[PDB]
């Protein structure tokens, strides 16, 4: 059994058939699974025909835009001793990261930057989603627009001692206008001043009742010295119609935080297309938990 | 369409749903109906 | 519990003396025992009362049913998906709990298929117990010189112990002094006729000598009396029970297949699992993790639903059997009897109907058949002629039975009759076709009659005439036709009379050994009128002197009469013959009777020939011919105990039609043995205790049910209830059936495994988003697949199974190569790419393109990235994703059911094609029905995306496996082409399951 099955020394065979059997199996094999491979291509090749290049033909699922932001928080929490360094450099990395892309010498000459209003303003359509018109251009976004959080004068933004910045930003989605809420009696209480009607608002507050007083001034910092987006940043064409384009940002300074306990800081951002979920965190609004332990 | 275009982003979901129940009742009843005809 | 003293062949003391005896166990001839010897006797060593049966728990019996091979694999299988949730949990946060999911599912599936399992057999165990009726009985014992009847419990050795006709012998007794005593000792010993009980012995052979009456035995007519030798479970058929309780039971073969089936499975599963480990390590991955893959690809290479759907699919074959009268302890002994390829049968109470019956009747120089069926199904004999009237009232008058009171209601051959067997054969046979022999006998007042005398050899009687217009007298008489020939001168021929010339005589002497050659006894009847002048109406011709010519009779004609078959045994050994099946004979009777009616039943075909057989037809000694001439042989018991273990070898290796006569129930399951040290399945049919040894031991035993023996129906697998043979016949058929359909279903629920891994090991190599959920497998596993796998068991046959050989259990298994490379290799492949397909187009929709999917994995899966760009440019945060990638499980099961379809449609039939055998099951065609319905059902319904995470699908999706599907269904149609049109080529070697 276990020797014979192996290797029989009258019929010569290997494992139970001669020499010219395992290649008809294996000839077999080759071809049938080659035919296999040549129908799932063509298949495939054919979906790739009944796709557009300039936008994608479901937007349903990426409806109410998120709102993200600069550190990269494991759970969601800001936790750093103003005495160790090495505690803050996560945080102040992802951020770098994020204002790396921001710099001026990568936005440079006409093409394809074009200076835009240093005011909120309108949208601003750049035709349709072809490719008559050469790539479109997006309009210029400054560092410095951030005042204190832009890593050109405190490279560690804030961290360094017991301030520290949160940079908001909107998820960028294709064909988006964004929409405020208009100056009606109903409007939120917050919002009534500085209604800029061109600049979609960003406000943060305490999630809990208590928590409010532990929690100091909130200064944000954006476009026009507004706390929110300018309309004029959109719409977005997709990355293939509009490669080089920039997002605006909004920065906020969380300063004089209580020390030595966790503070949970809800943002969220108003407007009409905008919607919220109990499920999604992320979808518009965002949470952070700061607990800046010295 | 321009910028009131918010029905680039809606899907009748609702709609779809209930078609897709009334054809899974009727595939079932059918099913049924195979299963018993000849027991009467 | 000595086996090997208790597997020898039965010993006694009978070669003795009734001094010897009394000397022995002590006891008065004439006196009998003392009550407080007999007391301090049955204080001693214990009552006469078998030994009850070793009680087995309920508990137990489900322990065992949770147990087995298949139930340990899944079993297995729950242990390794709760180490690999401990490892999860202790080495990482926020462990999932799929792994704890899939765990107690297991288990849960485990223990439903044991209660189902448990339930059936507890059913049988009923409806077995309400046949024990066991009423008490007591034996009529002398003590101190008087009589008294006490319980069967408080017999001893030693006491004397009478018996009367219609009584039970208690315990084994030795016969002191009988009166005509005879005893029914077909159960023990198989002897179909009743063997009368001398106080002389006789045989060496204690189971032959007359001087011993035994246990469980009956005396039919006489009395006797009998000092008890043997008492309690010391007797013969205690040892013989306590031998058949200490037998092993074995393994049938439908469980061999499927622990060679687990062997397969979970060799490619721990080959892939340690393939995927080692391949792991190359690719940077951790210890940790890699341990959590192998175990992963483990579990998943184990099917859930195979148990399930394999239960119920031979509990479904079960209940056809139910419906016929054939009741299965077991669960898998329905399976037993399609593998069988040598059958061992018994003679009395199997083969025949153990009842005499009159079998051939001569008158008017010509041999006239009688119905010898049950239900009486034949043809008649001609009722037209005188002679067989004159012969009814030979036969009606001349006869001292008489039918039982109170059996008006019974068939006129089940009733009771009190008499011996010929005169109940006889009267039964007048009450037949001649209709009450009550009012025949009142019509005709008996006179006077001479008993059967041994050295007249004769029975006679006279009585009065019914003819309104004759006074005169009749006288009839009935004995062997060698006597009665010579008392005659005349001869009834069609009515008239006729002289007695040597021309009749010689005719009369060809009957003779024609009627004796069949195994039959035969019997002359003759009468004559009594001249009333001679011998008026009123001389009385008291039995002194000879008042009645004894010669000068008229000859009317031989009456022969034989224990005729049961009606389907014929037909029903002719079938199995012709399957293949080796049909042995093995009984205890008589070799002259047992050759006959193999003759009559089909074991020894007609012009088939005996060594002994040859020599008489050559005159030559019978040590001169060739042993190798000869087909079929007689090998007798005597000559049986002498033979060594070859010489049995070539017994069964040389003769095809083999009977073995006067063999004792330990040579018979010797026989049985030397049937399985070759290699081929046994059933061995029975109904008394002597079978008990040979049922237990043989693959499968068949007990009589109305016929049989409460120890061989305990001690046997299979019972018929009604005592029908063609059962036989139509078991073989069922477990063949069966068993085409257990290959067909296994392949199904096998190919979906495929497009059930892949995912997982692209997911590992390919970094790809996961494409099939948990959830889902568990949907397609225990769901939707369970009802179309049941189905795939009321497929009915191809060709005719009733006519290809037996399968070789050494060669063709029940899960080969040939199957692994259909569900594994071909079909599950291109399940796996249409689902593949379905995927990519679900994710290509949304906007992540085939070329950016590749490499995501990392941040596909990480909890903190809010921001993830597609081929496009958009940015989709993590609950966003996450949607869309259980949408995609969603539409990946129901490609799995869409390619299901033709799969179950291309497993239907394994050579014949569809629009062939057609689509005739509607259980198949509710099984389609229902799949998609409930698929429909979990997508569609609202809340699932919150409890079991499945979210509707757009009306374009649902079609991107039907392609596939339709392609699956040509490539098998095109296969099962060639295979019929080439037989025996590549196609057929290489994927013919
Ligand atoms: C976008 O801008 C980034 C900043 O640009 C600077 O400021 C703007 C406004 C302009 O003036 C521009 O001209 C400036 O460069 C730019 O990142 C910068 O890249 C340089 C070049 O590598 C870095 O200089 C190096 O600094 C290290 C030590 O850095 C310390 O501080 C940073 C934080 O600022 C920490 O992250 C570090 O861990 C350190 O704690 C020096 O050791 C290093 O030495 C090298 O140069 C010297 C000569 O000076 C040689 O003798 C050595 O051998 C080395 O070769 C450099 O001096 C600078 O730190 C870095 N800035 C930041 C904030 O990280 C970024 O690359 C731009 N990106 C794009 C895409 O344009
Ligand atoms: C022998 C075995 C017989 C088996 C019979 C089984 C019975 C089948 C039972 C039902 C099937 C009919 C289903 C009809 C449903 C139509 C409902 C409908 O209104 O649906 C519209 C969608 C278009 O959706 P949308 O995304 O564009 O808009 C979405 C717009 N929102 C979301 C904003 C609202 O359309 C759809 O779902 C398309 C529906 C699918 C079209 C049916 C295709 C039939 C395919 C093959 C059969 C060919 C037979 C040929 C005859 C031969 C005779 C010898
Ligand atoms: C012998 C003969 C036998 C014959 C038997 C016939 C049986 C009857 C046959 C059919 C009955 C059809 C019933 C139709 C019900 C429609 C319900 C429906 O359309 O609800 C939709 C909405 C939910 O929409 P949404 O906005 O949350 O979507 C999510 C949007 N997002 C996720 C984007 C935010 O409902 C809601 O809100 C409220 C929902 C309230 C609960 C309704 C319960 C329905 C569940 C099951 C019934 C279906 C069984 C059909 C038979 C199948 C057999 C296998
Ligand atoms: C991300 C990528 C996805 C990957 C997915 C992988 C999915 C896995 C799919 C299938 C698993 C394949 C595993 C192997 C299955 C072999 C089946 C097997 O072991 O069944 C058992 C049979 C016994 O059968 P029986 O009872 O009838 O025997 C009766 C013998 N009596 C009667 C003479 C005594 O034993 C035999 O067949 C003898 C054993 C033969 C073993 C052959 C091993 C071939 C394996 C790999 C070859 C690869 C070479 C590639 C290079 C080609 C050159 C270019
Ligand atoms: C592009 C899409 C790709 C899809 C790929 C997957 C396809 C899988 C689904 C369906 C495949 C259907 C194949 C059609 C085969 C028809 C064969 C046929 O017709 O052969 C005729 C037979 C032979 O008769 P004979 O001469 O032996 O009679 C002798 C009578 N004596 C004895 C009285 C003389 O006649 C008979 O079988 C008797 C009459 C039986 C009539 C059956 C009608 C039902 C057929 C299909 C049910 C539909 C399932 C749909 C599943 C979807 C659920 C949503
Ligand atoms: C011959 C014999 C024929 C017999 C045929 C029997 C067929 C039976 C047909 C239908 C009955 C099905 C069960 C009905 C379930 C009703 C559930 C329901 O009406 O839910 C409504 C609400 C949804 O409310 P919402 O939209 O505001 O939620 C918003 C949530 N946000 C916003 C946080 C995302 O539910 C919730 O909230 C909580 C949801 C609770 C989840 C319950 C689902 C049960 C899960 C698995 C059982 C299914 C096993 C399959 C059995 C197959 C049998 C053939
Ligand atoms: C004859 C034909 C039969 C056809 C039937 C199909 C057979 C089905 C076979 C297997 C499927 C069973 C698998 C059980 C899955 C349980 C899943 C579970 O436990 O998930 C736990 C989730 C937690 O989720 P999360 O962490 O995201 O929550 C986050 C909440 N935050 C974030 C808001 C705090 O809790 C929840 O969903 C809460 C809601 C609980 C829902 C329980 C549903 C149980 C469904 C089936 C069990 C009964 C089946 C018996 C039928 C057998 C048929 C033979
Ligand atoms: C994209 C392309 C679509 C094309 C659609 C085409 C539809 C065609 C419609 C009906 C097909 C014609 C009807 C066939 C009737 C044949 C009757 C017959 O007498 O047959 C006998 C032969 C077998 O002879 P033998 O010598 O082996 O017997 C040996 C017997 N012994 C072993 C005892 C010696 O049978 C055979 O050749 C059967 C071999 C036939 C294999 C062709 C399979 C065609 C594929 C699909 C059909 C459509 C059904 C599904 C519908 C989907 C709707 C969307
Ligand atoms: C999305 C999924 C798509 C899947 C599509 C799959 C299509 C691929 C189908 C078949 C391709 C495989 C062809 C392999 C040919 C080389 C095999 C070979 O080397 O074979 C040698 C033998 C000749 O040796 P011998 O027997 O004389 O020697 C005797 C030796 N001893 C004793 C061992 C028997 O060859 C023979 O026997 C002849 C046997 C040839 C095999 C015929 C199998 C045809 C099966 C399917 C074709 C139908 C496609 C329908 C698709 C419709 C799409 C809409
Ligand atoms: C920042 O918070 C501090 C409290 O932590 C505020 O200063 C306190 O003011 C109260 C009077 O209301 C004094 O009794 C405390 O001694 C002060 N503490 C300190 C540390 O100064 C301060 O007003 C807050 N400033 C802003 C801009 O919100
Ligand atoms: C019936 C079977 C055997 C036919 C299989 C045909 C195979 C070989 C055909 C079908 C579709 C074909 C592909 C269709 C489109 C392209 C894109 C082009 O830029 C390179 C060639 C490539 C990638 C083709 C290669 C060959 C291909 C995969
Ligand atoms: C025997 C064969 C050819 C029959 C094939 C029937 C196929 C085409 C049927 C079976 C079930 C059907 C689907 C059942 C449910 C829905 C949901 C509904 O909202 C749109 C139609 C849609 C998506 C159906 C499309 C057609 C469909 C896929
Ligand atoms: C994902 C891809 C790369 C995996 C390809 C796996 C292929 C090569 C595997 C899958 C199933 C395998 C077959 C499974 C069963 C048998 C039967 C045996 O008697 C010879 C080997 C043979 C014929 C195997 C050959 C190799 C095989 C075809
Ligand atoms: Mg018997
Ligand atoms: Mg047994
Ligand atoms: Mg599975």
Same mark, same amino acid.
């Given at each position: 059994g276990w020797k014979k099955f192996l290797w029989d020394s009258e019929k010569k065979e290997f494992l139970g058939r001669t020499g010219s059997s395992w290649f008809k199996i294996f000839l077999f094999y080759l071809i049938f699974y080659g035919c296999l491979?040549?129908?799932?291509?063509?298949?495939?090749?054919?979906?790739?025909?009944?796709?557009?290049?300039?936008?994608?033909?479901?937007?349903?699922?990426?409806?109410?835009?998120?709102?993200?932001?600069?550190?990269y928080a494991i759970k969601t929490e800001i936790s750093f001793s103003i005495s160790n360094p090495k505690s803050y450099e996560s945080f102040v990395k992802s951020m770098h990261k994020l204002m790396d892309l921001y710099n001026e010498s990568s936005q440079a000459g006409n093409s394809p930057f074009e200076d835009c209003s240093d005011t909120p303003a309108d949208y601003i359509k750049r035709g349709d989603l072809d490719d008559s018109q050469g790539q479109k251009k997006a309009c210029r976004f400054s560092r410095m627009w951030l005042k204190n959080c832009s890593g050109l004068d405190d490279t560690t933004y804030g961290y360094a001692e017991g301030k520290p910045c949160v940079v908001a930003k909107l998820n960028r989605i294709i064909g988006f206008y964004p929409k405020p809420l208009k100056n009606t009696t109903d409007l939120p209480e917050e919002l009534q001043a500085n209604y800029n009607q061109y600049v979609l608002p960003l406000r943060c507050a305490a999630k809990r009742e208590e928590d409010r007083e532990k929690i100091g001034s909130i200064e944000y910092f954006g476009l026009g010295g507004y706390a929110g987006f300018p309309l004029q940043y959109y719409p977005y064409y997709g990355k293939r119609l509009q490669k080089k384009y920039l997002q605006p940002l909004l920065a906020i300074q969380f300063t004089n935080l209580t020390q030595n306990m966790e503070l949970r800081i809800e943002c969220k951002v108003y407007g009409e297309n905008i919607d919220y979920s109990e499920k999604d965190r992320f979808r518009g609004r965002f949470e952070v938990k700061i607990e800046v332990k010295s | 369409e321009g910028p009131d275009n918010d029905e680039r982003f809606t899907y009748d979901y609702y709609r779809l749903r209930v078609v897709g129940l009334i054809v899974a009742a009727v595939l079932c009843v059918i099913g049924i109906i195979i299963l018993l005809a000849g027991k009467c | 519990d000595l086996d090997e003293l208790k597997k020898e062949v039965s010993m006694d003391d009978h070669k003795l003396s009734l001094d010897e005896l009394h000397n022995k166990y002590g006891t008065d001839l004439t006196r009998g025992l003392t009550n407080a010897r007999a007391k301090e006797i049955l204080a001693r060593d214990g009552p006469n009362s078998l030994t009850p049966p070793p009680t087995t728990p309920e508990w137990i019996k489900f322990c065992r049913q949770l147990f087995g091979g298949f139930s340990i694999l899944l079993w297995i299988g729950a242990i390794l998906c709760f180490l690999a949730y401990g490892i999860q949990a202790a080495t990482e946060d926020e462990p999932a709990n799929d792994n704890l999911y899939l765990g107690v599912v297991l288990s849960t599936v485990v223990i439903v298929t044991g209660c189902f399992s448990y339930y059936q057999e507890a059913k049988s165990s009923r409806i077995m117990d309400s046949f024990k009726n066991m009423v008490p009985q007591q034996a009529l014992v002398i003590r101190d010189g008087e009589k008294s009847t006490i319980n069967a419990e408080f017999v001893v050795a030693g006491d004397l112990v009478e018996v009367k006709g219609g009584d039970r012998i208690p315990a084994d007794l030795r016969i002191i002094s009988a009166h005509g005593c005879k005893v029914?000792?077909?159960?023990?010993?198989? @002897?179909? &006729? =009743?063997?009368?009980?001398?106080? &002389?012995?006789?045989? +060496?052979?204690?189971?032959?000598?007359?001087?011993?009456?035994?246990?469980?035995?009956?005396?039919? +007519?006489?009395?006797?009396?009998?000092?008890?030798?043997?008492?309690?479970?010391?007797? /013969?058929?205690?040892?013989?029970?306590?031998?058949?309780?200490?037998?092993?039971?074995?393994?049938? =073969?439908?469980?061999?297949?499927? &622990?060679? %089936?687990?062997?397969?499975?979970?060799?490619?599963?721990?080959?892939?699992?340690?393939?995927?480990?080692?391949?792991?390590?190359?690719?940077?991955?951790?210890? *940790?993790?890699? /341990?959590?893959?192998?175990?992963?690809?483990? /579990?998943?290479?184990? =099917?859930?639903?195979?148990?399930?759907? /394999?239960?119920?699919?031979?509990?479904?074959?079960?209940?056809?059997?139910?419906?016929?009268?054939?009741?299965?302890?077991?669960?898998?002994?329905?399976?037993?009897?399609?593998?069988?390829?040598?059958?061992?049968?018994?003679?009395?109470?199997?083969?025949?109907?153990?009842?005499?019956?009159? !079998?051939?009747?001569?008158?008017?120089?010509?041999?006239? @058949?009688?119905?010898?069926? @049950?239900?009486?199904?034949?043809?008649?004999? $001609?009722?037209?002629?005188?002679?067989?009237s004159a012969l009814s009232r030979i036969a009606a008058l001349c006869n001292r039975a008489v039918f039982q009171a109170g059996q008006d209601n019974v068939p006129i051959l089940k009733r009771s009759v009190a008499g011996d067997a010929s005169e109940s054969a006889l009267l039964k046979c007048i009450e037949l076709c001649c209709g009450s022999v009550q009012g025949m006998r009142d019509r005709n007042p008996k006179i006077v009659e001479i008993p059967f005398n041994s050295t007249n050899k004769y029975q006679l009687s006279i009585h009065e005439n019914e003819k309104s217009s004759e006074s005169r007298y009749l006288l009839v008489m009935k004995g062997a036709p060698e006597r009665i020939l010579d008392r005659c001168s005349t001869i009834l021929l069609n009515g008239a009379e006729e002289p007695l010339k040597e021309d009749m005589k010689e005719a009369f002497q060809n009957a003779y050994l024609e009627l004796g050659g069949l195994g039959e006894r035969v019997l002359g009847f003759c009468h004559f009128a009594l001249p009333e002048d001679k011998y008026n109406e009123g001389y009385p011709f008291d039995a002194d002197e000879p008042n009645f010519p004894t010669t000068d009779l008229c000859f009317v004609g031989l009456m022969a009469m034989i224990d005729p078959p049961r009606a389907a045994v014929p037909d029903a050994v002719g079938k199995c013959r012709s399957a293949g099946i080796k049909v042995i004979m093995v009984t205890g009777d008589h070799p002259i009777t047992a050759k006959a009616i193999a003759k009559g039943v089909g074991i020894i075909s007609e012009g088939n020939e005996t060594i002994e057989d040859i020599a008489a037809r050559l005159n030559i000694p019978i040590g001169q011919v060739n042993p190798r001439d000869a087909k079929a042989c007689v090998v007798h018991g005597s000559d049986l105990k002498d033979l060594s273990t070859e010489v049995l070898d070539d017994i069964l290796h040389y003769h095809t039609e083999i009977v073995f006569a006067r063999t004792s129930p330990q040579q018979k399951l010797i026989i049985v043995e030397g049937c399985q040290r070759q290699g081929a399945i046994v059933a061995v049919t029975g109904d008394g205790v002597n079978d008990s040894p040979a049922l237990k031991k043989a693959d499968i035993g068949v007990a009589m049910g109305i016929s049989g023996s409460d120890v061989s129906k305990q001690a046997a697998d299979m019972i018929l209830l009604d005592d029908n043979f063609a059962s036989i016949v139509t078991g073989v058929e069922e477990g063949r059936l069966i068993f085409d359909n257990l290959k067909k279903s296994i392949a199904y629920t096998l190919t979906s495994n495929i497009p059930e891994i892949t995912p997982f090991l692209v997911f590992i190599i390919g970094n790809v988003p996961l494409p099939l959920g948990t959830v889902t497998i568990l949907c397609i596993d225990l769901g939707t697949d369970m009802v179309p796998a049941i189905s795939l068991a009321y497929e009915q046959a191809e060709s005719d199974i009733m006519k290809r050989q037996p399968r070789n259990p050494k060669t063709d298994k029940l899960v080969?190569?040939?199957?692994?490379?259909?569900?594994?290799?071909?079909?599950?492949?291109?399940?796996?790419?249409?689902? %593949? %397909?379905?995927? %990519?187009?679900?994710? !290509?929709?949304?906007?992540? *393109? =085939?070329?950016?999917?590749?490499?995501?994995?990392?941040?596909?899966? $990480?909890?903190?990235?809010? $921001?993830?760009? $597609?081929?496009?440019?958009?940015?989709?945060?993590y609950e966003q994703r996450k949607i869309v990638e259980f949408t995609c499980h969603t539409s990946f099961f129901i490609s799995i059911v869409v390619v299901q379809w033709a799969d179950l449609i291309i497993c239907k039939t394994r050579r014949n094609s569809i629009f062939q055998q057609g689509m005739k099951n509607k259980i198949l065609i509710f099984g389609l029905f229902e799949e998609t319905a409930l698929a429909a059902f979990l997508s569609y319904c609202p809340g699932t995306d919150v409890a079991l995470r499945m979210y509707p699908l757009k009306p374009s999706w649902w079609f991107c496996a039907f392609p596939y599907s339709l392609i699956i269904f040509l490539y098998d149609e095109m296969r099962r082409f060639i295979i019929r049109r080439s037989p025996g080529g590549w196609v057929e070697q290489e994927t013919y399951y």
């Open positions: 491979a040549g129908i799932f291509i063509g298949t495939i090749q054919v979906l790739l025909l009944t796709l557009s290049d300039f936008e994608p033909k479901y937007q349903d699922r990426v409806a109410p835009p998120g709102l993200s932001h600069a550190p | - | 029914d000792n077909s159960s023990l010993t198989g @002897e179909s &006729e =009743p063997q009368t009980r001398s106080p &002389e012995f006789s045989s +060496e052979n204690p189971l032959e000598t007359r001087n011993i009456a035994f246990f469980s035995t009956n005396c039919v +007519e006489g009395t006797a009396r009998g000092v008890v030798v043997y008492t309690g479970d010391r007797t /013969v058929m205690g040892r013989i029970a306590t031998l058949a309780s200490g037998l092993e039971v074995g393994r049938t =073969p439908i469980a061999i297949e499927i &622990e060679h %089936f687990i062997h397969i499975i979970t060799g490619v599963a721990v080959f892939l699992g340690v393939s995927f480990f080692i391949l792991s390590l190359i690719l940077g991955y951790s210890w *940790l993790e890699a /341990v959590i893959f192998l175990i992963g690809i483990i /579990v998943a290479n184990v =099917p859930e639903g195979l148990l399930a759907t /394999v239960t119920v699919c031979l509990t479904l074959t079960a209940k056809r059997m139910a419906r016929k009268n054939c009741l299965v302890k077991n669960l898998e002994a329905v399976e037993t009897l399609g593998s069988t390829s040598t059958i061992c049968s018994d003679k009395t109470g199997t083969l025949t109907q153990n009842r005499m019956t009159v !079998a051939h009747m001569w008158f008017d120089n010509q041999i006239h @058949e009688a119905d010898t069926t @049950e239900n009486q199904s034949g043809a008649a004999f $001609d009722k037209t002629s005188a002679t067989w080969n190569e040939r199957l692994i490379s259909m569900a594994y290799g071909q079909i599950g492949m291109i399940q796996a790419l249409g689902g %593949f %397909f379905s995927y %990519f187009v679900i994710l !290509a929709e949304n906007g992540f *393109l =085939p070329m950016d999917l590749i490499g995501k994995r990392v941040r596909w899966d $990480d909890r903190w990235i809010s $921001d993830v760009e $597609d081929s496009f440019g958009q940015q989709w945060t």
